[PDB]
DNA sequence: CAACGTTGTTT
DNA sequence: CAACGTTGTTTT
């Protein structure tokens, strides 16, 4: 997807991601660089977003089931990436095809070593082709089985990079959100959908790149139909909007 | 090593590499090419010494427990060697360190087509860096034992290789010796020996490309303390002096 | 990390 | 040779 919704306070956001560890014992992931969250309902490629990946990443002796939160750069920027402003990276890579993921070298080298993330949203927005070419916002969200209290966060399978400045500076973290075929509650709005990683497993294997091979990963790549929405107004069409308004229901 | 001695005459030679069979038959090994034998008490790169291997480098149906013994060129000529002249080779393959030997391609790639080889020898000489001078002290080095009559010869691990003259010519038989740390016993002469198979068993699995594997015949390749050695006068450090001078004790 | 262009070794 | 080290555009 092109846009997403990810507003909780710190505080809640890491609540809302307690876990079990591979001894069953229930955790909260611990934060790298916390001060880089910044929270908004109108997420953009090239904002930062919270995304969950293996502790095993950062410390060499460590329990790869244990999670880290850490916000990173939405537009997955390559290693070998060799002008000094991301952002003039030539092509996209705010989304990577599941069909030929292992076949592109953007996303294939770091997919290889590992670097497999979970991004977190409350939801992420998508248009539908209306005729005239005014198209229509939709929020959309896993099922909710006041709201905000115990929101279940929707969790989408990334691949992450790590980029050195060649001029100097901190190692860049940037991700790639995953998309699939829509299913078939969503096939009206949309072509495509995110890789939607559905409940602790998922999440878990998707995550633990210690204990679970590349090829293993790829089948919780998929669509899947545990998904519902709403039409929303059109203050979330301009970026710079972040209000309650921009999934509020219409 | 850089220098041996081997100056027993090809009668005297074959009859001191008496061996068994895999039937436990004693055997004398069969020559090729004897009349390139050139006996001398001072052996240097680019000459031919008499090393033992595999009678099934030569015959497609041979039991791979009988050696033959044929005089090579010490200094393994690469098959890919692209030039007329061998001895232009800008590479030094007089040795091979046994800790990178499956990392350097001229040497793993005939190490895995099993040419292997025993490098023979009455001993070997190495010069010992004395402290305050330049002037280095020369040393024989063989086994434990006038003594002629029944001296046992000693057997170096080498890997051989096969180069065909671009421009025609017979296919040149060259060897590296394998070289490993040098043991307690001589680390005071020098920081490196060669890899010197130890007995009728270490021999035979050396040689036996077909029943002892790479990873099998690379745990023969290590330091040995069974050596001894005496200093020696420095008639052996000019290459082109060829007396029994040359490993005479002092 | 598959494709591709280069190089090969020790005291 | 063939094993090395080096290279590098992507989506809706």
Same mark, same amino acid.
């Not at 990276?89 to 997919?111: A, G, H, I, W, Y």
């Not at 190692?171 to 096939?187: A, E, H, N, P, R």
């Given at each position: 997807?092109?846009?997403?919704?990810?507003?909780?306070?710190?505080?809640?956001?890491?609540?809302?991601?307690?876990?079990?560890?591979?001894?069953?014992?229930?955790?909260?992931?611990? +934060? !790298?660089?916390?001060?880089?969250?910044?929270?908004?309902?109108?997420?953009? &490629?090239?904002?930062?977003?919270? %995304? #969950?990946? =293996?502790?095993?990443?950062?410390?060499?002796?460590?329990?790869?089931?244990?999670?880290?939160?850490?916000?990173?750069?939405?537009?997955?920027?390559?290693?070998?990436?060799?002008?000094?402003?991301?952002?003039?990276?030539?092509?996209?890579?705010?989304?990577?095809?599941?069909?030929?993921?292992?076949?592109?070298?953007?996303?294939?080298?770091?997919?290889?070593?590992?670097?497999?993330?979970?991004?977190?949203?409350?939801?992420?927005?998508?248009?539908?082709?209306?005729?005239?070419?005014?198209?229509?916002?939709?929020?959309?969200?896993?099922?909710?089985?006041?709201?905000?209290?115990? +929101? !279940?966060?929707?969790?989408?399978?990334?691949?992450?990079?790590?980029?050195? &400045?060649?001029?100097?500076?901190? %190692? #860049?973290? =940037?991700?790639?959100?995953?998309?699939?075929?829509?299913?078939?509650?969503?096939?009206?709005?949309?072509?495509?959908?995110?890789?939607?990683?559905?409940?602790?497993?998922?999440?878990?294997?998707?995550?633990?790149?210690?204990?679970?091979?590349?090829?293993?990963?790829?089948?919780?790549?998929?669509?899947?139909?545990?998904?519902?929405?709403?039409?929303?107004?059109?203050?979330?069409?301009?970026?710079?909007?972040?209000?309650?308004?921009?999934?509020?229901?219409?």
């Amino acid at each position: 997807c092109g846009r997403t919704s990810c507003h909780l306070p710190r505080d809640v956001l890491t609540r809302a991601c307690a876990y079990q560890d591979r001894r069953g014992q229930q955790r909260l992931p611990e +934060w !790298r660089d916390p001060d880089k969250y910044c929270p908004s309902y109108n997420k953009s &490629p090239q904002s930062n977003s919270p %995304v #969950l990946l =293996s502790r095993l990443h950062f410390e060499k002796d460590a329990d790869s089931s244990e999670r880290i939160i850490a916000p990173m750069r939405w537009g997955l920027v390559p290693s070998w990436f060799k002008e000094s402003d991301p952002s003039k990276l030539q092509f996209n890579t705010t989304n990577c095809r599941s069909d030929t993921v292992m076949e592109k070298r953007s996303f294939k080298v770091p997919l290889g070593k590992g670097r497999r993330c979970v991004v977190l949203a409350d939801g992420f927005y998508e248009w539908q082709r209306c005729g005239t070419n005014q198209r229509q916002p939709y929020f959309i969200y896993f099922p909710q089985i006041k709201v905000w209290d115990n +929101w !279940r966060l929707l969790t989408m399978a990334g691949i992450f990079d790590c980029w050195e &400045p060649p001029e100097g500076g901190d %190692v #860049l973290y =940037s991700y790639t959100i995953i998309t699939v075929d829509s299913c078939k509650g969503l096939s009206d709005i949309h072509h495509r959908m995110p890789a939607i990683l559905d409940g602790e497993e998922a999440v878990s294997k998707w995550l633990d790149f210690g204990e679970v091979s590349t090829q293993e990963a790829l089948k919780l790549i998929h669509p899947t139909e545990n998904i519902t929405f709403h039409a929303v107004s059109s203050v979330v069409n301009n970026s710079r909007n972040n209000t309650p308004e921009c999934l509020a229901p219409v």
